[PDB]
Coordinates of C-alpha atoms in Angstrom, one line a residue:
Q1 CA -31.8 -4.6 -20.3
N2 CA -30.8 -3.5 -23.9
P3 CA -27.8 -5.1 -25.6
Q4 CA -25.5 -2.4 -24.5
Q5 CA -26.3 -2.9 -20.6
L6 CA -26.0 -6.7 -21.1
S7 CA -22.7 -6.6 -22.5
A8 CA -21.4 -4.1 -19.9
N9 CA -22.8 -6.2 -17.2
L10 CA -21.4 -9.4 -18.6
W11 CA -17.8 -7.9 -18.6
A12 CA -18.2 -6.5 -15.1
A13 CA -19.2 -10.1 -14.0
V14 CA -16.2 -11.7 -15.6
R15 CA -13.8 -9.4 -14.0
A16 CA -15.6 -9.6 -10.9
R17 CA -14.6 -13.3 -10.8
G18 CA -11.0 -12.6 -11.4
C19 CA -11.4 -13.6 -15.2
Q20 CA -10.9 -11.7 -18.2
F21 CA -12.1 -11.7 -22.0
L22 CA -9.6 -9.5 -24.3
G23 CA -11.8 -9.2 -27.4
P24 CA -12.5 -11.8 -30.0
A25 CA -9.1 -11.6 -32.1
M26 CA -6.9 -11.1 -28.9
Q27 CA -8.4 -13.9 -27.0
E28 CA -8.3 -16.2 -30.0
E29 CA -4.7 -15.7 -30.0
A30 CA -4.1 -16.0 -26.4
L31 CA -6.0 -19.3 -26.6
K32 CA -3.9 -20.5 -29.5
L33 CA -0.7 -19.9 -27.3
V34 CA -2.1 -21.7 -24.3
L35 CA -2.6 -24.5 -26.5
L36 CA 0.9 -24.2 -28.2
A37 CA 2.3 -24.5 -24.7
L38 CA -0.1 -27.3 -23.6
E39 CA -1.3 -29.5 -26.5
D40 CA 1.7 -31.7 -26.1
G41 CA 0.8 -32.3 -22.4
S42 CA 3.5 -30.2 -20.8
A43 CA 2.6 -29.3 -17.3
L44 CA 3.2 -25.6 -16.5
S45 CA 2.6 -23.4 -13.4
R46 CA 0.5 -20.3 -13.7
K47 CA 3.8 -18.2 -13.6
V48 CA 5.2 -20.3 -16.5
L49 CA 2.2 -20.4 -18.8
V50 CA 1.6 -16.7 -18.5
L51 CA 5.1 -15.9 -19.2
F52 CA 5.0 -18.1 -22.3
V53 CA 1.8 -16.5 -23.6
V54 CA 2.5 -12.9 -22.8
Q55 CA 5.9 -13.1 -24.6
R56 CA 4.5 -14.2 -27.8
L57 CA 1.3 -12.1 -27.5
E58 CA 2.7 -8.6 -26.6
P59 CA 4.4 -8.3 -29.9
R60 CA 1.1 -8.4 -31.8
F61 CA -1.2 -7.1 -29.0
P62 CA 1.0 -4.8 -27.0
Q63 CA -1.8 -4.1 -24.4
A64 CA -1.0 -7.7 -23.2
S65 CA 0.2 -8.0 -19.6
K66 CA 1.2 -10.5 -17.1
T67 CA -2.1 -9.4 -15.3
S68 CA -4.6 -9.8 -17.9
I69 CA -3.0 -13.0 -19.2
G70 CA -3.2 -14.2 -15.6
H71 CA -7.1 -13.6 -15.9
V72 CA -7.6 -15.4 -19.0
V73 CA -5.8 -18.5 -17.6
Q74 CA -7.9 -18.0 -14.6
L75 CA -11.0 -18.2 -16.8
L76 CA -9.8 -21.7 -18.3
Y77 CA -8.9 -22.8 -14.6
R78 CA -12.6 -21.9 -13.7
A79 CA -13.8 -23.8 -16.6
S80 CA -12.3 -27.2 -15.5
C81 CA -9.9 -27.3 -18.6
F82 CA -7.0 -28.5 -16.5
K83 CA -5.6 -31.4 -14.8
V84 CA -3.8 -30.0 -11.7
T85 CA -0.7 -31.6 -10.0
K86 CA 1.1 -30.7 -6.8
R87 CA 4.3 -32.1 -5.1
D88 CA 4.6 -30.2 -2.0
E89 CA 6.4 -26.9 -2.3
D90 CA 6.7 -27.0 -6.2
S91 CA 4.1 -25.0 -7.7
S92 CA 1.0 -26.4 -9.0
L93 CA 1.3 -27.4 -12.4
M94 CA -1.7 -27.3 -15.1
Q95 CA -2.1 -29.8 -18.0
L96 CA -4.7 -29.3 -20.7
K97 CA -7.0 -32.5 -20.2
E98 CA -6.6 -34.7 -23.5
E99 CA -10.1 -33.9 -24.4
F100 CA -9.5 -30.3 -24.7
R101 CA -6.2 -30.3 -26.7
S102 CA -7.5 -28.9 -29.8
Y103 CA -8.8 -25.4 -30.4
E104 CA -12.2 -26.2 -31.3
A105 CA -12.8 -28.0 -27.9
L106 CA -10.8 -25.5 -25.8
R107 CA -12.8 -22.7 -27.2
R108 CA -16.0 -24.5 -26.4
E109 CA -15.2 -24.9 -22.6
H110 CA -14.0 -21.2 -22.8
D111 CA -17.1 -20.0 -24.4
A112 CA -19.1 -22.2 -22.1
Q113 CA -17.6 -20.7 -18.9
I114 CA -18.5 -17.0 -19.9
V115 CA -22.1 -18.2 -20.7
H116 CA -22.0 -19.8 -17.3
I117 CA -21.1 -16.7 -15.7
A118 CA -23.8 -14.7 -17.6
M119 CA -26.2 -17.3 -15.8
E120 CA -24.6 -16.9 -12.4
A121 CA -25.2 -13.0 -13.0
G122 CA -28.8 -13.3 -14.1
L123 CA -28.1 -12.1 -17.7
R124 CA -30.3 -13.5 -20.4
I125 CA -28.5 -13.1 -23.8
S126 CA -29.4 -14.6 -27.0
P127 CA -27.3 -16.7 -29.4
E128 CA -26.9 -13.9 -31.7
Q129 CA -25.5 -11.6 -29.4
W130 CA -23.4 -14.3 -27.9
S131 CA -21.8 -15.0 -31.4
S132 CA -21.1 -11.3 -31.7
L133 CA -19.6 -10.8 -28.4
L134 CA -17.3 -13.7 -28.3
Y135 CA -16.5 -14.1 -32.1
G136 CA -17.4 -10.6 -33.6
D137 CA -19.6 -12.2 -36.1
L138 CA -22.8 -14.0 -36.5
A139 CA -21.6 -17.2 -37.7
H140 CA -21.4 -18.8 -34.5
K141 CA -25.1 -18.5 -33.5
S142 CA -25.7 -22.3 -33.7
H143 CA -22.5 -23.0 -31.6
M144 CA -23.6 -20.9 -28.9
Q145 CA -27.1 -22.0 -29.1
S146 CA -25.8 -25.5 -28.3
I147 CA -23.7 -24.4 -25.5
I148 CA -26.6 -22.5 -23.7
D149 CA -28.7 -25.9 -24.4
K150 CA -25.9 -28.0 -22.6
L151 CA -25.7 -25.6 -19.7
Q152 CA -29.4 -25.5 -19.0
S153 CA -30.7 -28.9 -19.9
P154 CA -29.7 -32.5 -19.1
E155 CA -28.7 -34.5 -22.2

């Protein structure tokens, strides 16, 4: 598998799992809004989190929708970023775990989850291409290498 097939297969795999990556710039801003909502420990349902983000994101990125922001939220859920609460018949609320209440940390779980999906899908992808895929540059090679290590090997 050449680079072009790897990337196409990756995003198929992500969408296949009810998740979504919106592109490096858009996803960045999406995560920044999630964190704006949750960094102080507020506890929001899917509905309310989605509504919060989509209303701030659509002006700058008009392709944004409830569905697609739902999928990003799903990605972060699938990555165990949230403490989830339930009082019967209220909706499930999500809080960011304390350890993930910063852009750098949250972004690391996020990136890891996508890498995990590549693994579930049998897709071997180098750190250079990972940086390209998730950041649109090559300055995050080492950051991604580190994530691969932690997913493959016990520390």
